[PDB]
Design a protein around this ligand. Structure first.
Ligand SMILES: [Mg+2]
Ligand SMILES: [Mg+2]
Ligand SMILES: [Mg+2]
Ligand SMILES: [Mg+2]
Ligand SMILES: [Mg+2]
Ligand SMILES: [Mg+2]
Ligand SMILES: [Mg+2]
Lengths: 146, 118, 53
RNA sequence: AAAAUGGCAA
RNA sequence: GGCGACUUUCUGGUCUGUAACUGACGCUGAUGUGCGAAAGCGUGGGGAUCAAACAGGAUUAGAUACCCUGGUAGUCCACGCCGUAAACGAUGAGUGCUAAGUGUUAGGGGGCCCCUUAGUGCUGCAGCUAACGCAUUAAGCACUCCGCCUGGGGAGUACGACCGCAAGGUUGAAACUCAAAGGAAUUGACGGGGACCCGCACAAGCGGUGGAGCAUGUGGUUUAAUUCGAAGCAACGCGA
RNA sequence: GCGGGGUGGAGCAGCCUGGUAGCUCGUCGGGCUCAUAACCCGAAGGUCGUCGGUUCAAAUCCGGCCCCCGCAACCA
RNA sequence: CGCGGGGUGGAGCAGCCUGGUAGCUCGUCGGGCUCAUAACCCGAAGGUCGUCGGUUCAAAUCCGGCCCCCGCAACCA
């Protein structure tokens, strides 16, 4: 009951890091259209992760997202493992990162996010575990790949 | 303690419920066998070609221990996993000398079971 | 009996085997005799098949 | 897969 | 009714051609007399498969079903019995006549083609028909003979008879009751029918409601009165 | 005459061995549905037949009373 | 009274023998999916091995002690 696909919106590169993904991550953090708070949290978190890591914040962020993003996922049609769309893969990575950061018990969101991205780079992150869990069920339904 | 037969015949029986693969010597004595159920595939999965592939692989690996290098494929039943099973045998590295279909056809023999009214 | 040709792909030989099975129509015969059908029904289906041809 | 039923007149 | 491996023996019917012979010797057919799927019945035998009944398992609100695993009679043979099937072409038999096109089976005749005979299909005039349809394989047009019907239900029941080992079969009402039962076709609506398509319909997402307190509407209950109206979506921060 | 039982509205555990009320259904409130059924969610309801006894404490053990049930009721 | 056997998540059941390396299966518990239900799938928890000593690099593992349980003899106060 739908005519076809709709063109997706585009984001301007984040001024600090000149990265689209940083802009996208800000948007996911933002709540109630409060951009300033979201930008503040991400930039502060990036500074914190960089300090603790001793490596470029953008570098660790790249490593983190790579670990969180999943190659295969299962969709009911039975659940069938399917290749995740490249744009979808980025969406899932950023989504899990912020969600798992909120689950973390650090008092300040900026501390949570910085710990998560560092842990995600370590591959010990909870968002990375979510990827693992998504991959486990995909391997389980490999017979139903057809 | 170890068998040493180079040439054997692999019998693949494919049914909608399950697929069974057995590797035997030319004489017909079984060297090894594997099944979807044996590999832990259950329900719908047993029919799936992937399950049949895996069954063929497991049976082939054991056969290679028996020293089988060349194998002949014999196919029985209409199960979908037959195609994958034959490929899996060669993927395991067993040479397929020949492929034949042995599924039984009666010349108007015994009465079949009733049709399922559901 | 289909025999895999020398220096031929197993999948190619399997394709040839599949074609040979299709020619035999053995699978088709097995599927027909999976479930019993009433003798009158058999004749009707045969007649319908002839009409299809 | 399961999947019942619905006052009589107007 | 039925009849599907092959072989032999015994045996019935049909069709083409010819025109030897016979010379209307024909047609139908009450009553009779036989044959007659499957199931069933009796006696003796056999028993692989399948499978009423029966038993688990499952399903479900229940599941004396559907599905699954078993399983007895039966399914098979012989000889009796039963005598019915949507036993159907829901189309009695014999005969003659009335456009064509095309496929196929078994022939015959004459030049791959034509002609012709008996079947077996499809298509389609004239004509017929309530309509659907039928149409040289009539449901057209005619003649002979037989069977059968005359609203629905009660009821293929009751009684009686006959027949059957039995199951039952054949024959076959009435009192009473209703104003209708029906056939065909049309237009809608509908379908755990189909095809092609839409909508935040779903999916992919984001933020909520249902929980707390409070505001307001409504139901209910209460009251002298708690004014009346709104009531699934399309009443309920609605008239206000 | 001798045994058994009497537990939410119902049926049935707990009693042997004192401290502990369970299950299935029904019920009540909500959801689902056009509505009902089914289904789903949440909750309530039994002084344990009745009077006594014992015990720190009784459904639980012990003694009466009432109700209900089974068995026995024989020989001349 | 002797002989034989065993004691391992809530439970059953291996590694014991042939020391290093408590596995397996249900019962659980939370998720995913199922309209659903079930099933299936994913994650998590629960025995330090009957107990106590000895030996050993290291013992549930072996050797001992001890206890519990089971089976069989003993079953003519
Ligand atoms: Mg009605
Ligand atoms: Mg019969
Ligand atoms: Mg059956
Ligand atoms: Mg009749
Ligand atoms: Mg003709
Ligand atoms: Mg609220
Ligand atoms: Mg209801």
């Amino acid at each position: 009951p739908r005519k076809g696909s709709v063109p997706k919106r585009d984001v301007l590169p984040d001024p600090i890091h000149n990265s689209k993904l940083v802009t996208k991550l800000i948007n996911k953090i933002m709540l109630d259209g409060k951009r300033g708070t979201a930008q503040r949290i991400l930039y502060s978190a990036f500074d914190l992760v960089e300090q603790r890591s001793g490596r470029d914040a953008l570098e660790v962020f790249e490593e983190a997202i790579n670990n969180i993003m999943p190659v295969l996922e299962v969709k009911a049609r039975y659940q069938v493992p399917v290749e995740v769309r490249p744009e979808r893969r980025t969406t899932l990575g950023l989504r899990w990162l912020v969600n798992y950061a909120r689950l973390r018990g650090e008092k300040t969101m900026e501390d949570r996010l910085a710990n998560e991205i560092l842990d995600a780079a370590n591959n010990t992150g909870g968002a990375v575990k979510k990827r693992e869990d998504t991959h486990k069920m995909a391997e389980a339904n490999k017979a139903f790949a057809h | 303690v170890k068998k040493n037969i180079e040439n054997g015949v692999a019998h693949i029986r494919s049914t909608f419920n399950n697929t069974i693969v057995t590797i035997t010597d030319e004489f017909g004595n079984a060297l090894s066998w594997s099944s979807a159920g044996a590999l832990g595939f259950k329900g719908s999965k047993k029919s799936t070609p992937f399950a049949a592939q895996m069954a063929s692989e497991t049976a082939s690996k054991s056969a290679m221990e028996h020293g089988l290098k060349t194998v002949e494929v014999t196919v029985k039943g209409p199960g979908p996993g037959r195609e994958s099973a034959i490929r899996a045998l060669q993927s395991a590295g067993l040479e397929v000398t020949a492929i034949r279909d042995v599924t039984p056809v009666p010349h108007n023999g015994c009465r079949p079971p009733k049709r399922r009214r559901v | 009996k289909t025999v895999v040709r020398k220096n031929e792909s197993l999948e190619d030989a399997l394709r040839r085997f599949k074609r040979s099975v299709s020619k035999s129509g053995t699978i088709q015969e097995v599927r027909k005799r999976e479930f019993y059908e009433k003798p009158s029904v058999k004749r009707k289906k045969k007649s319908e098949a002839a009409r299809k041809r």
